[PDB]
Amino acid sequence: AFELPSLPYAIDALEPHISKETLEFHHGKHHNTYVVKLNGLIPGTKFENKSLEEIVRSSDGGVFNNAAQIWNHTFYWNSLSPNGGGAPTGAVADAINAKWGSFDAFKEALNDKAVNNFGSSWTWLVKLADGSLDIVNTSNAATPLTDDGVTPILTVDLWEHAYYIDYRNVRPDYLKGFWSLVNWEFANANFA
Amino acid sequence: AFELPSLPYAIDALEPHISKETLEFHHGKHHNTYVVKLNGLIPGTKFENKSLEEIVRSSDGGVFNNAAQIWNHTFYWNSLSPNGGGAPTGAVADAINAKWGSFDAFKEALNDKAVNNFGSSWTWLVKLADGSLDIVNTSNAATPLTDDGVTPILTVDLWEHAYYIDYRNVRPDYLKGFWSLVNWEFANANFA
Ligand SMILES: [Fe+3]
Ligand SMILES: [Fe+3]
């Protein structure tokens, strides 16, 4: 059975960008729920023995929605850090410059993609087959994990539960918080 | 151009099932935003002259998402009432009994569809071409308004902004609030 991964940092470590309360419901209830629902769904199917990633890459319907959300949220918690934020560094900063000319142009581009990602969704920084970076949006539980040759490097959860407590309807403010928390080390770890 | 309709009741009339705060955000910011967005999208286009319903039934993309959302929310405010709730009445009470055998089976069928309506969504009580009632789920801005011969009779908004402030992650509690508020007069007007 799958388990709810621990949060990589204290429940208040993301303040004042993401609240202790948001983390309590988002990790504690939302993430958790996906884990208990999947655990309940797999027994008696050709999924009980397989990897979380294996399932996400070979299911649909309910099993997919749950397995993919578990994966996406775990990747999301890692995309933030009490020590992230600020300028990108290393290999990712460079690929960012190679593709968008500048960090600022990339940030504007991602913000644009995320603010207009309609409904429950995720906005991703990914690495394509050519080694170049790109930004892609997915709806609901969809994830670049199921794209052969497309490597996820960072994600931002845009479901309303991710920011409603702290920011209500204002996604731009939430995005300002994400940029104060973005984990460039996890990004570079994934890019390399 | 389009305007935000007035709520059919006082900002605190749905208390304690849906809060004054939820109404201020849901009606005052979200509903309003779709209206500003549409008005900002139709000028000098093949939709500037059309009515809301004509636009929703002849667009896609951004224009569809905003027009439909304005329509769906308006229909949602009408599906609630400080004088609604309790047992269904009149023609709809009888049409529910005809399809599901009883009000209780209908309520459990709708609750099941609504709690499992994945991501941002809407659950509708609709009247079909054959005249029989049914429950259908739509995602994001999709609405039965675009299905010929299908008549929307009531809707429950399941986007998380509809209940997060009041119930956080617990859709079942929000659903309990909806049943205390359901507008059977609105439903009977749509049915007849
Ligand atoms: Fe989430
Ligand atoms: Fe809504």
Q: Distances in Å between the alpha carbon of A63 and those of A68, B2, B114, B170, B171?
A: 8, 42, 18, 21, 20
Does the distance separating the beta carbons of A139 and B25 come in below 8 Å? no
What's the distance, Cα to Cα, between the start and end of chain A in Å? 30
Residue A54 near residue A162, CB atoms below 8 Å = no
Residue A114 near residue A156, CB atoms below 8 Å = yes
- Report helix, strand and coil shares of chain B as percent, to nearest 5: 50, 10, 35
Q: Distances in Å between the alpha carbon of A114 and those of A5, A107, A160, B67, B184?
A: 26, 10, 12, 21, 39
A12 is in an annotated binding site: no
Q: Distances in Å between the alpha carbon of B58 and those of B40, B67, B68?
A: 18, 10, 11
Other C-beta atoms within 10 Å of B25: how many? 19
Exposed e or buried b for every residue in B36-67, given b needs 16+ CB within 10 A?
A: ebbeebbeeeebeebebeebbbebeeebbbbb
How many folded domains does chain A comprise? 1
d(CA B19, CA B41): 32
Residue A155 near residue A75, CB atoms below 8 Å = yes
d(CA A41, CA A57): 16
| Sheet containing A133-139: order of strands | A133-139, A121-127, A151-157
Residue A102 near residue A93, CB atoms below 8 Å = no
Other C-beta atoms within 10 Å of A80: how many? 28
Measured CA angle at A42 (ends A159, A60), to 5 deg:
50
User: In chain B, where does DSSP find H-type helix?
Assistant: 20-25, 32-41, 52-56, 61-78, 90-100, 103-115, 164-167, 171-181, 184-191
Does the distance separating the beta carbons of A140 and B161 come in below 8 Å? no
Find the residue in B nearest to A27 (Cα): B169
d(CA A169, CA B30): 7
Residue A146 near residue B143, CB atoms below 8 Å = no
Does the distance separating the beta carbons of B33 and A159 come in below 8 Å? no
Look at strands A133-139 and B121-127 and give their pairing: unpaired
In chain A, positions 43-82, which contact chain B (CB-CB < 8 Å)?
65
- Resolution limit, Å: 2.1
What domain range includes position A55? 1-192
d(CA B25, CA A59): 37
A30 is in an annotated binding site: no
Other C-beta atoms within 10 Å of B106: how many? 20
Q: Distances in Å between the alpha carbon of A34 and those of A38, A65, A89, B112, B148?
A: 6, 8, 33, 17, 36
Q: Which residues surround ligand 1, an ion (CB under 5 A)?
A: A 157, 159, 162
Cα radius of gyration (chain B): 16
Other C-beta atoms within 10 Å of B165: how many? 19
Q: For B100, which DSSP code? A: H
- The residues, any chain, with a CB within 8 Å of residue A36's CB and separated by 6 or more, are none
Q: Residue A175 has which token pair?
A: 């995005």
d(CA B53, CA B38): 13
Residue B56 near residue B152, CB atoms below 8 Å = no
CB-nearest to A169 from B25, B65, B140 is B25
**Sign of the alpha-carbon torsion through B164, B66, A76, A138:** positive
Residue with tokens 């994830």: A143
Residue A23 near residue A80, CB atoms below 8 Å = no
d(CA A152, CA A35): 21
Q: Which residues of A touch B29 (CB under 8 A)?
A: 168-169
d(CA A66, CA B43): 42
> Is the minimum CB–CB distance between A140 and chain B shorter than 8 Å?
yes
Residue with tokens 């397989």: A50
Residue B148 near residue A169, CB atoms below 8 Å = no
d(CA B101, CA B95): 9
d(CA A92, CA A99): 11
Phi, psi of B135 (to 5 degrees): -115, 125
- The residues, any chain, with a CB within 8 Å of residue A147's CB and separated by 6 or more, are none
- For an interface test with A, which of B140, B163, B166 has the most A Cβ atoms less than 10 Å from its Cβ? B140
The long-range contacts involving B167-172, CB below 8 angstroms and separated by at least 24 positions, are B168/A25, B168/A29, B168/A161, B168/A165, B169/A25, B169/A29, B169/A30, B169/A33, B169/A161, B171/B114, B171/B115, B172/B111, B172/B115
Does the distance separating the beta carbons of A168 and B29 come in below 8 Å? yes
